[PDB]
Amino acid sequence: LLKRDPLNSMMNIPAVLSRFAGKGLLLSENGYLRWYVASMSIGAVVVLALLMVL
Amino acid sequence: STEVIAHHWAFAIFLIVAIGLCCLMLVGGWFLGGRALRLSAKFYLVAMFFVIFDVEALYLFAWSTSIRESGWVGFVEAAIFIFVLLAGLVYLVRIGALDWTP
Amino acid sequence: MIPLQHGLILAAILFVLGLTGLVIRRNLLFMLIGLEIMINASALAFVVAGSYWGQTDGQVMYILAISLAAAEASIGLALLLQLHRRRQNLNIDSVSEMRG
Amino acid sequence: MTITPQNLIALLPLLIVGLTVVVVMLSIAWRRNHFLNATLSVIGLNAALVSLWFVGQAGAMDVTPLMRVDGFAMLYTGLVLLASLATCTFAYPWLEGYNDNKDEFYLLVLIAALGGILLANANHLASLFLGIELISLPLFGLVGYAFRQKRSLEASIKYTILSAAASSFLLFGMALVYAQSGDLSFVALGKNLGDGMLNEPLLLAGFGLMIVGLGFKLSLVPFHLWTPDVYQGAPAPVSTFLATASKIAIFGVVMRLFLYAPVGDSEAIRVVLAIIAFASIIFGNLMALSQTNIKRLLGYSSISHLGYLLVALIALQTGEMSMEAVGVYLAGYLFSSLGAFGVVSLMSSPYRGPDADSLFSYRGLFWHRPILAAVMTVMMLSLAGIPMTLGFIGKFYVLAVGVQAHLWWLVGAVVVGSAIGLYYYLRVAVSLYLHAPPSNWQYSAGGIVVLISALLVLVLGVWPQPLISIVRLAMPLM
Amino acid sequence: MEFAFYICGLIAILATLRVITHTNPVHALLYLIISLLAISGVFFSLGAYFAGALEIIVYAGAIMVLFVFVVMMLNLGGSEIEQERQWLKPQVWIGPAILSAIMLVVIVYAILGVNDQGIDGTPISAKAVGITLFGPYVLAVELASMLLLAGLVVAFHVGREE
Ligand SMILES: CCCCCCCCCCCCCCCCCC(=O)OC[C@H](COP(=O)(O)OCCN)OC(=O)CCCCCCCCCCCCCCCCC
Ligand SMILES: CCCCCCCCCCCCCCCCCCCC
Numbered sequence: 022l023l024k025r026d027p028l029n030s031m032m033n034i035p036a037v038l039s040r041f042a043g044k045g046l047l048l049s050e051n052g053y054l055r056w057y058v059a060s061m062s063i064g065a066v067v068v069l070a071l072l073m074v075l
Numbered sequence: 076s077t078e079v080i081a082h083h084w085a086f087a088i089f090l091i092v093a094i095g096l097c098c099l100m101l102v103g104g105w106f107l108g109g110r111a112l113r114l115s116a117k118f119y120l121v122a123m124f125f126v127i128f129d130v131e132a133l134y135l136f137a138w139s140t141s142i143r144e145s146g147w148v149g150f151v152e153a154a155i156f157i158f159v160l161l162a163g164l165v166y167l168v169r170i171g172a173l174d175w176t177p
Numbered sequence: 178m179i180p181l182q183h184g185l186i187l188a189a190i191l192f193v194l195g196l197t198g199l200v201i202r203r204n205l206l207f208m209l210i211g212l213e214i215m216i217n218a219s220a221l222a223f224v225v226a227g228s229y230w231g232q233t234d235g236q237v238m239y240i241l242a243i244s245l246a247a248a249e250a251s252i253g254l255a256l257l258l259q260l261h262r263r264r265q266n267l268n269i270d271s272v273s274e275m276r277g
Numbered sequence: 278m279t280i281t282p283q284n285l286i287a288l289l290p291l292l293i294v295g296l297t298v299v300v301v302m303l304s305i306a307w308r309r310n311h312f313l314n315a316t317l318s319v320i321g322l323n324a325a326l327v328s329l330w331f332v333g334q335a336g337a338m339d340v341t342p343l344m345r346v347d348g349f350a351m352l353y354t355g356l357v358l359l360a361s362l363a364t365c366t367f368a369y370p371w372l373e374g375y376n377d378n379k380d381e382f383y384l385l386v387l388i389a390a391l392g393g394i395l396l397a398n399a400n401h402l403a404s405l406f407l408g409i410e411l412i413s414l415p416l417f418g419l420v421g422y423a424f425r426q427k428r429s430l431e432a433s434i435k436y437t438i439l440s441a442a443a444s445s446f447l448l449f450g451m452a453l454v455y456a457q458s459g460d461l462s463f464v465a466l467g468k469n470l471g472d473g474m475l476n477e478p479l480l481l482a483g484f485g486l487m488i489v490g491l492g493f494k495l496s497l498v499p500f501h502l503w504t505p506d507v508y509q510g511a512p513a514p515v516s517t518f519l520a521t522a523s524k525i526a527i528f529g530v531v532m533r534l535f536l537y538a539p540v541g542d543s544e545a546i547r548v549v550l551a552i553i554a555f556a557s558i559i560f561g562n563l564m565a566l567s568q569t570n571i572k573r574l575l576g577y578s579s580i581s582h583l584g585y586l587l588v589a590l591i592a593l594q595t596g597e598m599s600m601e602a603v604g605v606y607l608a609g610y611l612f613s614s615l616g617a618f619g620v621v622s623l624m625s626s627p628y629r630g631p632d633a634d635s636l637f638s639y640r641g642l643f644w645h646r647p648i649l650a651a652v653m654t655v656m657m658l659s660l661a662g663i664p665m666t667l668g669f670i671g672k673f674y675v676l677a678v679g680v681q682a683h684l685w686w687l688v689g690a691v692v693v694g695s696a697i698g699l700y701y702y703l704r705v706a707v708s709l710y711l712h713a714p715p716s717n718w719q720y721s722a723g724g725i726v727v728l729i730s731a732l733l734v735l736v737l738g739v740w741p742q743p744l745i746s747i748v749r750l751a752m753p754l755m
Numbered sequence: 756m757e758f759a760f761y762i763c764g765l766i767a768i769l770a771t772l773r774v775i776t777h778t779n780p781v782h783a784l785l786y787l788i789i790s791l792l793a794i795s796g797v798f799f800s801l802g803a804y805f806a807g808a809l810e811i812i813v814y815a816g817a818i819m820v821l822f823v824f825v826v827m828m829l830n831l832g833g834s835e836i837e838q839e840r841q842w843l844k845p846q847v848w849i850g851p852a853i854l855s856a857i858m859l860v861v862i863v864y865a866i867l868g869v870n871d872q873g874i875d876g877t878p879i880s881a882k883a884v885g886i887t888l889f890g891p892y893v894l895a896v897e898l899a900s901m902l903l904l905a906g907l908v909v910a911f912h913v914g915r916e917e
Pocket of ligand 1: 032033035036037039040566692693696697700
């Protein structure tokens, strides 16, 4: 049951999550200028909303 | 006061009468009477040179109305500004950007 | 006689309209037009703020802002001409060769 | 404020760089000579760098309502001038293969250095805005200097559009701040408020829009998406300048803004910058995992390292060694990025035509370019924060500063992002040492520059006391 | 005086809204020039006489001339612009309009919570702008000349023909 070293896999889990999160974040780099402008405006909305909330 | 508001009324009347005059001139013209290559980049270059040197000219417009108040210090600053402007102009002339003939 | 918040609201409206025009238009020319609207709205806001305080710094910031507007318009239109020369179109979705 | 001749002594590097711009432009107008104009540009930059000593003899004071000169200004002027000199040195072998005009590059590098010096000495919103634009527009030219290349034209268009939008955001935010404050000086942003009324909504919104523009310029999340595309598309010396000098000058003026402003210690602004720094660290390390292109990898690296710097900036109002930490980290990151982008620039020089590739191909570099491979692996170890390198000294400073101010989320972010960085930097280094299937003194000068950067990183990693001593010596006006 | 401000501001907003939604570039630029004239009238209603003068001289008389010149040189006779009308589809513009309306709501909420004593509209002449421009703000003048030189060199290098 243990011959595949389960604790080693449990400690390899953060690398799997890091690879999946990096692949998910790389979808924002689609290379479209209009999306970059849109993301800048979205971040402006988020920053201003956070400043008004706090 | 009354003189400034009188001049404002006169200027407003001037603008509206001139605009209405041209508009009704076209209205009467349209209303009366019976009825039956490759664009070179030099034009963009000279237009952009006009834009840039017009902004530098705006700075000199601001300076020119207050020369006495700024003194010789303002004269030195404006001389540096004008020298940079003339160096840019000499550069544009010498690299052939302002030469139209081949 | 004119509230400061009214002039600032006008400038915010024009900035938001310029940003919307910059986002929703695929044509590079209308994106440059929206950029000009945004920077002119910011310059208008500086003029409003300077006229409220009675200071001359607002028109100075206007002058610097329109110097930036002139130079950025010059650079953007040169880039637009180069794109139209070497690709014969101005759709900005096609300029996406670098990604990931 | 008027200008005395001692104020002109404090104005010295700006004057020398401006006179260099004029002289180089007049020399181009005389005759297009690549070697003479490059020599004039580097002579002017060296003259400004050595005139920093005469500025230091003058003392710390204010030359204008706009400019304030002190040790802080001298330090970041020196960093900008070093980055500009390195950019010219890398640009000459790359420009030797450029069949079109070559000297406008040096003219634009000089103007961008002038903008960096203005941002170093800035004490005013007008000077901040003008320095940012004076940096940005020569970068519009330089990013697309090889506009016949498709990727370079793409990167130029993207950077021009996005930086114009960011400048509009910054300008509108400054206008709202000036509407609230009534003075554009850094020390008077929030001075009229008091007794818990610091979180005024218009002031906070203006600072938010300024933060949008600055975080575009600093490649901070979520204004980060341009960085790998622009870094990849730009010419390699342009990538060197854009990674080093622009980020250093803009972060210096942001440090001055958050140090002098009475609203810089606002809790809301601190929390917003903490969120931005956390996301910047994590995202810039996560997106560089699967990067097979060295330019995009270094772009995400820039995102993460600017996030670490932002962590050092958040603890500015609470701690006291934050300015020292930022100076040490900025020197380390300057030398690391100079070495890495210089190796990329040297292996991509000369410019082999607009219709061919501009790729680096880092695999098996040691078996034909061993010294460049050694420099590049030292740079990758330095960017990973590994000890015996100056990047570790910077990371240690950032962690000490964060621990001192109890910024525990940022400390955990630095640890996690450092581990992810370890993965991809080590992958690049072993790819350098795997197996794969010049001849002029300016290429030799570029190699000497990257080698001296590598030696500086190693020596100041095993002995960082001279750097700490010269950074603590650069105190601004308290 | 306030009537001039409100009328010119309304004209500027309406002309800008017509700019960002029009398909013909020439009509869009004409509406943009109208909006710039309206904003200049706003400047003249606030006492910033020099700002309005430069708004017509430079922004409406130099920059829009350059945009018009580029539109002429493109020879837009229906060159993949007029035929699409893709931005009028609600799936394209509804999202960004919602985002920009949220941003406008946040900015206006910030603006409405400021102390307002009103704008007196006292005319700040170009003499005062020239005094403060070549006094305290003169390094800004010299480095703005350098900025314009940078734009000149960049646009010449990019926009040649060869
Ligand atoms: C006792 C638990 C509580 C205390 C914890 C204290 C923290 C320190 C001690 C634990 C550290 C655990 C980190 C485990 C990392 C494993 C990395 C690894 O195995 O990398 C190898 C692997 C490359 O091999 P391969 O899978 O073939 O590649 C695929 C494509 N290259 O690489 C990959 O596939 C991609 C590698 C991505 C980057 C490395 C992973 C980083 C993950 C976050 C690091 C920080 C974790 C903090 C603690 C989390 C909980 C343990
Ligand atoms: C620890 C900081 C960096 C120190 C220097 C890193 C290495 C620099 C280059 C030294 C020479 C390396 C030689 C590698 C030979 C590999 C042979 C492999 C054979 C299978």
